[PDB]
Amino acid sequence: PRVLAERGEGHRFVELALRGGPGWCDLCGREVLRQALRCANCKFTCHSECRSLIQLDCR
Numbered sequence: 001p002r003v004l005a006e007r008g009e010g011h012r013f014v015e016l017a018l019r020g021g022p023g024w025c026d027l028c029g030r031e032v033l034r035q036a037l038r039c040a041n042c043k044f045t046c047h048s049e050c051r052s053l054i055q056l057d058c059r
């Protein structure tokens, strides 16, 4: 249903619905449990708590 995503003044980060499929924090390279934030706009599927550490602008 949710077609629009909170773009904001920077990264969009598309919440990866982990309802059966795992997620790998491309940033670090480990396994992600929580709704990993995947900024397909430039970055990738990063860890939820890691998103706060990523202060990069939307390339």
Ligand SMILES: [Zn+2]
Pocket: 010, 011, 012, 013, 039, 041, 042, 043, 057, 058, 059
């Ligand atoms: Zn971005």
Ligand SMILES: [Zn+2]
Pocket: 025, 027, 028, 029, 046, 047, 050
């Ligand atoms: Zn991480």
